[PDB]
Amino acid sequence: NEYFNSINDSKILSLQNKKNTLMDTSGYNAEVRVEGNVQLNPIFPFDFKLGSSGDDRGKVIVTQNENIVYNAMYESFSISFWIRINKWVSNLPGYTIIDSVKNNSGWSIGIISNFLVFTLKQNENSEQDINFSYDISKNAAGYNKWFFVTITTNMMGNMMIYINGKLIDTIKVKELTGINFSKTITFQMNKIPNNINMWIRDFYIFAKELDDKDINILFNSLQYTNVVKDYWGNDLRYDKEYYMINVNYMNRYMSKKGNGIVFNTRKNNNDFNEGYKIIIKRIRGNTNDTRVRGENVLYFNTTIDNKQYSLGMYKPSRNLGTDLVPLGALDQPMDEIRKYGSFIIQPCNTFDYYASQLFLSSNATTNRLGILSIGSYSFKLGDDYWFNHEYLIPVIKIEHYASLLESTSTHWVFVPAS
């Protein structure tokens, strides 16, 4: 993998976290001061955390050597990093998050409303900026997920912005004479005149203009692809309460009627605080460290009333369709769970979400009998006596699922109840 080596050669700043310490692994050794309350994750991804709070609030400062800035001050450069913001509402007020401006010239990354804007400044009057806007329809609860920004900028060429490898917006760099780039970059959440958290990790700057194939290599090299992720992009974990949601039905929560699990309409889309929660329990796995990974055999528990059930197949009051069998809440021992309630998880990540697919397992082995989907069907559940009713239920298609294998109706996500 030269691809990886050739890129690193142009790396002028590498803000990593080693040995529980923020430092510059570029080689050019920038100074890294950590003022205020800056929480530091000891677990991977070794991110560092900031806040918008008053008084003692987080501030990370990075100061560079003149020699290496001077080189990239007029040619070409790229900025790339992982970022996450909690409660990134659409009505959010303006904030400067990452700033590199000294005497009213430089560059600055900031966020306002549903926008993450990257501005280029020469003087207090004139400034050109490129931005990314998140899809408010797809993220009613706030864009709270981890995402990988990349900004390529050529001073006589072009100024582009990428999110998760996908080029979002691209505009022409105007004639910018007298543009002085600062030797300091400051990570701090400063509100703009007239309470959120921010996680940053792996902040790199390069001395060239990265292309699509380079960016996506970087994007992919900077994650554990086989570690399944929750809705916000953190490592999905066993023995932790999540809300299980289908990607095609984000406005439904999980409820129960009789033996059946039935999906119901959310009251609102501010939080995900609604319905019954599930807990992922491991059965089979290559590693054993609480993180859920591809090809793991697993099952789901959930505490409904003061009892605790496990998700599993059951026989409905009448046939729902060919090869189709509902998943429901059952009080069953492990021997039954292994036969009729065990799944093989496969991570399925896209630009829009961190999701996963779930395959019914044969006797808690990795051999796949079917796939977990969702659908509305008419039958009897619980007290239902006189009439059938339409229930939106989780359903397993057995044997023939090549059609569903590519459908987003089999994409499941998990939102923590923190």
Side-chain angles (χ1 to χ4, degrees), residues 2 49 98 170 194 203 226 250 289 336:
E2 265 182 27
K49 186 183 178 171
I98 305 178
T170 172
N194 288 41
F203 188 89
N226 198 38
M250 293 298 195
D289 73 333
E336 299 296 310

Side-chain angles (χ1 to χ4, degrees), residues 17 82-83 102 117 147 217 227 229 235 243 291 318 330 355 362-363:
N17 171 353
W82 287 96
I83 180 160
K102 200 158 191 174
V117 76
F147 65 102
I217 277 165
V227 174
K229 309 303 195 322
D235 298 356
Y243 291 105
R291 289 179 182 81
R318 42 136 141 169
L330 308 167
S362 174
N363 307 286

